[PDB]
Structure formats: structure tokens, C-alpha cells
A paper describes a structure:
Self-labeling protein tags such as HaloTag are powerful tools that can label fusion proteins with synthetic fluorophores for use in fluorescence microscopy. Here we introduce HaloTag variants with either increased or decreased brightness and fluorescence lifetime compared with HaloTag7 when labeled with rhodamines. To engineer the binding site, ten amino acids on helices 6–8 in close proximity to TMR were chosen for randomization by site-saturation mutagenesis. The changes in spectroscopic properties result from single or double point mutations in the direct vicinity of the bound fluorophore.
The brightest variant, the double mutant HaloTag9 (HaloTag7-Q165H-P174R, ΔI = 19.9 ± 0.5%), as well as the dimmer variants HaloTag10 (HaloTag7-Q165W, ΔI = −52.9 ± 1.2%) and HaloTag11 (HaloTag7-M175W, ΔI = −44.8 ± 0.8%) were chosen for characterization with a panel of 46 different fluorophores and analysis of their photophysical properties. HaloTag10 and HaloTag11 decreased the fluorescence intensity of almost all tested fluorophores compared with HaloTag7. The decreases were more pronounced for HaloTag10 than for HaloTag11 but in both cases caused by changes in quantum yield. For HaloTag10 and HaloTag11, the proximity of TMR to the introduced tryptophans suggests that photoinduced electron transfer (PET) quenching of the fluorophore is responsible for the decreased quantum yields. The decreased quantum yields and fluorescence lifetimes of HaloTag10 and HaloTag11 presumably result from PET quenching through the newly introduced tryptophans. HaloTag10 and HaloTag11 decreased the brightness of all fluorophores relative to HaloTag7, HaloTag10 having the biggest effect. Photostability measurements showed that the higher the fluorescence lifetime, the more photobleaching occurred, making HaloTag9 the least and HaloTag10 and HaloTag11 the most photostable tags. We therefore recommend the use of HaloTag9 and HaloTag11 for multiplexing of two species and HaloTag9, HaloTag10 and HaloTag11 for multiplexing of three species.
Numbering used by the authors: 3 to 294
């Protein structure tokens, strides 16, 4: 049975006038490992992978601004907002060199930070990450009508903000195996008040789909161009059928990206961490040992 508890002691750092929550476990020496979550999760999504890495490495998993146990100021919560906060989070913790373990929107932050700081990244493990979606035909059929609704200010805000559809609908429909009530309540916890659900709506409105928004497509195309050139060791977890990364796209990127190893986790949609945390955690620890 996949674990449901969150036993990590809370840590907080002040940043741009707000406090951000982060997990900090493992031995201090070595290269720290930085876990970046996405929408609509938090560091809770890493709770069963970190125990495979914490024996030998320091594990840092922050809650994005406006999410988890972090502060929730009245922001627009655009992707630029998360960039400015994650930039100053990494600097506030004195993280000189890091290994990235990123997912969903945490991967957009991780890849964009790596492009701007390539000398400070010693490895990138990633899964179901932000890539350009050329047309809506490359988006999964069963989720197309829902995400097109999300990307409007009338229907999309009614579903995500008023009815909490991204937590009540999108989250369980992004995991193959059934979630428990305790696991749902952990994801419901940061967004009990509808006024705090702004990040849950802006994030899908930022997804680079069909060239829109053009500023996010351009940004993702740049760090995807840097990925193809960089020699940084890469670990690519993928699931079947997946959501953002279909198996065929993972097969192409495993061979086209330099020093990229691909791992099949079995059945999976978007939250691969909830479908096979033991394989993901153990494969990260093994892969870290082959980098020294
Ligand atoms: Cl999203």
C-alpha cells in the first residue's frame, strides 16, 4: 500500500516578502536534490519517493508560492510569478549546485532555471513535463473538452475556482490507481477557501497549447532547445498512456536528448509519482550513485 502520511518537519524561508514551505531531509553533504511539484499538487506528491533518496542525499522539496503550506499573496500567479519566487528560493537556501527532480509545472521552472544556470545543474530527473503542444490533437482526447473549458474566464473560472474541479476532477482523473480519502484531503488542504484557488486556474491557462500563450511557447521552446544541446545527465520517467508525454514522445526524447536514460513506470497518466513511487524513487537513487 502506497503511503498516505506526510511526516516531514516544516521549514520556512522568507522570500520577496512571503514565506515558502519546504521539506529538508537527508544528510547535509553531497549534492542536494531539489524536487519541484506542479499543478495541483505540492511537496505531498514526493512523500513516497523522497524516502528512497533521503538515506544518501539531501532532499529539498518546496511548496510553490500560493500552494501547499507556502504563503498565498494576492498574485496573478502567472508562470513569471513562480519564476521570480523559485529563483529567490534557490538563492535563499544557498543552493550552489543541485540535481533537479521535476514534474509538470515544476519542470517548466526546473528546465528554465537550468537553461539560465547550466553550470549549477548536475542532473535532471523529470516526468510528464511541460513541452509545446503543437495542436489540440496532440492533447489527450478524454481531457480536451475539459481543458478547453478551463482556458476561459467564464466557464473555466466557474469550474476551477467556484467548484474546485481541478482538485475534485482533474486530480483523480490524472492518476490511474484509486486515491484514498486521506490522500484527497491532503490535496484539498491548501485550497479549502475558494479565494486561494487562483493558481489552479492560471496554470492551465499558461499551458503552451496550439501556440498559445505565445510567450510561454517561446520560453518552453528555448529550454527545450537547450535540453537537446546540454550534456547534463537526464533521467526520463514516463507512463502509459500518459498525459503530457505519450510513450512515443518519450521514446523520441530518450534517443534524441544527450545522456538521457528512460524508465517505464507502467500504467500512468500525469501524476506518475502516485502510480509507481517505489520504482521512481529507487531508480533516482541508483541513477544518482552513477553520477557521484
Ligand atoms: Cl495546469
Amino acid at each position: 500500500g502506497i503511503g498516505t502520511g506526510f511526516p516531514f518537519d516544516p521549514h520556512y524561508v522568507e522570500v520577496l516578502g512571503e514565506r515558502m514551505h519546504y521539506v529538508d531531509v537527508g544528510p547535509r553533504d553531497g549534492t542536494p536534490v531539489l524536487f519541484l511539484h506542479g499543478n495541483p499538487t505540492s511537496s505531498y506528491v514526493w512523500r513516497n519517493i523522497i524516502p528512497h533518496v533521503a538515506p544518501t542525499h539531501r532532499c529539498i522539496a518546496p511548496d510553490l508560492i500560493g500552494m501547499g503550506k507556502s504563503d498565498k499573496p494576492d498574485l496573478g500567479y502567472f508562470f513569471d510569478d513562480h519564476v521570480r519566487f523559485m529563483d529567490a528560493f534557490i538563492e535563499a537556501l544557498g543552493l550552489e549546485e543541485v540535481v533537479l527532480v521535476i514534474h509538470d509545472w515544476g519542470s517548466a521552472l526546473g528546465f528554465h532555471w537550468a537553461k539560465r544556470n547550466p553550470e549549477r545543474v548536475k542532473g535532471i530527473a523529470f516526468m510528464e513535463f511541460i513541452r509545446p503542444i503543437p495542436t489540440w490533437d496532440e492533447w489527450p482526447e478524454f481531457a480536451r473538452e475539459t481543458f478547453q473549458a478551463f482556458r476561459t474566464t467564464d466557464v473555466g473560472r466557474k469550474l476551477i475556482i467556484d467548484q474546485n474541479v481541478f482538485i475534485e476532477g482533474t486530480l483523480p482523473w490524472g492518476v490511474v490507481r484509486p486515491l484514498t480519502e486521506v490522500e484527497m484531503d491532503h490535496y484539498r488542504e491548501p485550497f479549502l477557501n475558494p479565494v486561494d484557488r487562483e493558481p489552479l486556474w492560471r496554470f492551465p491557462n499558461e499551458l503552451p497549447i496550439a501556440g498559445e500563450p505565445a510567450n510561454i511557447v517561446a520560453l518552453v521552446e528555448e529550454y527545450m532547445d537547450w535540453l537537446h544541446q546540454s550534456p547534463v545527465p537526464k533521467l526520463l520517467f514516463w507512463g502509459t498512456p500518459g498525459v503530457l508525454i505519450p510513450p512515443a514522445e518519450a521514446a523520441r526524447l530518450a534517443k534524441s536528448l544527450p545522456n538521457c536514460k528512460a524508465v517505464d513506470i507502467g500504467p500512468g497518466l500525469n501524476l506518475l509519482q502516485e502510480d509507481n513511487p517505489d520504482l521512481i524513487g529507487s531508480e533516482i537513487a541508483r541513477w544518482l550513485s552513477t553520477l557521484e
